[PDB]
Short mmCIF file of all heavy atoms in Angstrom, two decimals:
data_model
loop_
_atom_site.label_atom_id
_atom_site.label_comp_id
_atom_site.label_asym_id
_atom_site.label_seq_id
_atom_site.Cartn_x
_atom_site.Cartn_y
_atom_site.Cartn_z
N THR A 90 6.54 -20.72 -34.14
CA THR A 90 6.21 -19.71 -35.25
C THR A 90 4.70 -19.62 -35.37
O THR A 90 4.14 -18.58 -35.61
CB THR A 90 7.02 -20.17 -36.42
OG1 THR A 90 8.42 -19.94 -36.26
CG2 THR A 90 6.60 -19.32 -37.60
N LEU A 91 3.98 -20.73 -35.36
CA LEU A 91 2.53 -20.77 -35.55
C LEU A 91 1.78 -19.99 -34.44
O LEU A 91 0.81 -19.27 -34.65
CB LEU A 91 1.93 -22.21 -35.51
CG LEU A 91 0.45 -22.33 -35.65
CD1 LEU A 91 -0.05 -22.15 -37.14
CD2 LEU A 91 -0.11 -23.63 -35.08
N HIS A 92 2.29 -20.27 -33.17
CA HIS A 92 1.55 -19.59 -32.04
C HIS A 92 1.77 -18.13 -32.13
O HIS A 92 0.88 -17.33 -31.72
CB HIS A 92 1.98 -20.18 -30.73
CG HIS A 92 1.28 -21.50 -30.40
ND1 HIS A 92 1.66 -22.68 -30.95
CD2 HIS A 92 0.24 -21.72 -29.60
CE1 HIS A 92 0.93 -23.62 -30.51
NE2 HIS A 92 0.04 -23.09 -29.69
N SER A 93 2.92 -17.75 -32.59
CA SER A 93 3.24 -16.35 -32.69
C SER A 93 2.45 -15.69 -33.90
O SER A 93 1.82 -14.72 -33.70
CB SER A 93 4.72 -16.05 -32.83
OG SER A 93 4.95 -14.70 -33.10
N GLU A 94 2.71 -16.32 -35.11
CA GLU A 94 2.47 -15.40 -36.21
C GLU A 94 1.06 -15.67 -36.77
O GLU A 94 0.46 -14.76 -37.40
CB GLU A 94 3.50 -15.60 -37.29
CG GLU A 94 4.78 -14.83 -36.97
CD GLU A 94 5.96 -15.46 -37.67
OE1 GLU A 94 5.69 -15.93 -38.82
OE2 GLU A 94 7.07 -15.52 -37.02
N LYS A 95 0.55 -16.78 -36.43
CA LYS A 95 -0.87 -17.19 -36.75
C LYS A 95 -1.80 -17.06 -35.60
O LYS A 95 -2.90 -16.49 -35.91
CB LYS A 95 -0.80 -18.68 -37.35
CG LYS A 95 -0.37 -18.67 -38.76
CD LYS A 95 -1.55 -18.92 -39.69
CE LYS A 95 -1.24 -19.79 -40.92
NZ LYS A 95 -2.28 -19.61 -42.00
N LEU A 96 -1.45 -17.54 -34.43
CA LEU A 96 -2.50 -17.59 -33.40
C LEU A 96 -2.47 -16.36 -32.46
O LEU A 96 -3.45 -16.06 -31.78
CB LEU A 96 -2.34 -18.89 -32.62
CG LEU A 96 -2.36 -20.11 -33.50
CD1 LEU A 96 -1.94 -21.38 -32.85
CD2 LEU A 96 -3.78 -20.28 -34.04
N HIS A 97 -1.30 -15.66 -32.42
CA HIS A 97 -1.07 -14.44 -31.60
C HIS A 97 -1.24 -14.74 -30.08
O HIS A 97 -1.86 -13.99 -29.28
CB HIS A 97 -1.92 -13.22 -32.05
CG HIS A 97 -1.81 -13.09 -33.59
ND1 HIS A 97 -0.67 -12.72 -34.21
CD2 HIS A 97 -2.78 -13.33 -34.51
CE1 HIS A 97 -0.92 -12.72 -35.58
NE2 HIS A 97 -2.14 -13.14 -35.72
N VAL A 98 -0.77 -15.92 -29.63
CA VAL A 98 -0.92 -16.35 -28.26
C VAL A 98 0.26 -15.69 -27.48
O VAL A 98 1.40 -15.75 -27.79
CB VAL A 98 -0.77 -17.86 -28.14
CG1 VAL A 98 -0.70 -18.24 -26.70
CG2 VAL A 98 -2.05 -18.52 -28.80
N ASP A 99 -0.14 -15.05 -26.34
CA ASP A 99 0.86 -14.46 -25.48
C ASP A 99 1.60 -15.66 -24.84
O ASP A 99 0.90 -16.45 -24.22
CB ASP A 99 0.09 -13.61 -24.46
CG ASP A 99 1.05 -13.00 -23.39
OD1 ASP A 99 2.20 -13.40 -23.25
OD2 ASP A 99 0.47 -12.15 -22.66
N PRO A 100 2.88 -15.73 -25.06
CA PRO A 100 3.61 -16.89 -24.49
C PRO A 100 3.64 -17.00 -23.06
O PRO A 100 3.88 -18.09 -22.45
CB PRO A 100 5.12 -16.71 -25.09
CG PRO A 100 5.21 -15.24 -25.35
CD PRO A 100 3.80 -14.79 -25.78
N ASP A 101 3.37 -15.86 -22.33
CA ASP A 101 3.22 -16.06 -20.82
C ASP A 101 2.13 -17.12 -20.55
O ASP A 101 2.16 -17.85 -19.52
CB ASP A 101 3.00 -14.71 -20.18
CG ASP A 101 2.91 -14.98 -18.63
OD1 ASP A 101 4.00 -15.29 -18.16
OD2 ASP A 101 1.83 -14.91 -17.88
N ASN A 102 1.16 -17.20 -21.41
CA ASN A 102 0.06 -18.20 -21.22
C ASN A 102 0.56 -19.61 -21.25
O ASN A 102 -0.08 -20.51 -20.61
CB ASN A 102 -1.08 -18.06 -22.22
CG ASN A 102 -1.77 -16.69 -22.08
OD1 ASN A 102 -2.37 -16.16 -23.11
ND2 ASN A 102 -1.77 -16.14 -20.93
N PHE A 103 1.72 -19.86 -21.94
CA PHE A 103 2.23 -21.27 -21.96
C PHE A 103 2.75 -21.57 -20.52
O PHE A 103 2.55 -22.75 -20.13
CB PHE A 103 3.38 -21.36 -22.94
CG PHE A 103 3.15 -20.98 -24.40
CD1 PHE A 103 4.12 -20.32 -25.08
CD2 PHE A 103 1.99 -21.38 -25.05
CE1 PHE A 103 3.98 -20.01 -26.38
CE2 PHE A 103 1.79 -21.03 -26.44
CZ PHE A 103 2.85 -20.27 -27.08
N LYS A 104 3.29 -20.66 -19.74
CA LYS A 104 3.69 -20.89 -18.40
C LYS A 104 2.44 -21.17 -17.56
O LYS A 104 2.50 -22.09 -16.65
CB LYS A 104 4.40 -19.74 -17.84
CG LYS A 104 5.59 -19.23 -18.65
CD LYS A 104 6.37 -18.20 -17.74
CE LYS A 104 7.81 -18.26 -18.23
NZ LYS A 104 8.13 -17.15 -19.16
N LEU A 105 1.41 -20.47 -17.77
CA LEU A 105 0.16 -20.63 -16.91
C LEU A 105 -0.51 -21.98 -17.14
O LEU A 105 -0.82 -22.63 -16.20
CB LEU A 105 -0.72 -19.43 -17.19
CG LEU A 105 -0.16 -18.08 -16.89
CD1 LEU A 105 -1.20 -17.08 -17.21
CD2 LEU A 105 0.30 -17.97 -15.42
N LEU A 106 -0.53 -22.35 -18.49
CA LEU A 106 -1.19 -23.65 -18.68
C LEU A 106 -0.18 -24.67 -18.10
O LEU A 106 -0.68 -25.67 -17.56
CB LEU A 106 -1.32 -23.88 -20.27
CG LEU A 106 -1.89 -25.19 -20.58
CD1 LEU A 106 -3.25 -25.54 -19.98
CD2 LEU A 106 -2.02 -25.17 -22.14
#
Side-chain angles (χ1 to χ4, degrees):
Chain A
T90 289
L91 178 80
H92 279 80
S93 173
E94 280 154 35
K95 279 254 218 200
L96 307 167
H97 313 289
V98 171
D99 178 345
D101 182 70
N102 297 155
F103 303 139
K104 304 190 154 101
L105 302 177
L106 180 56

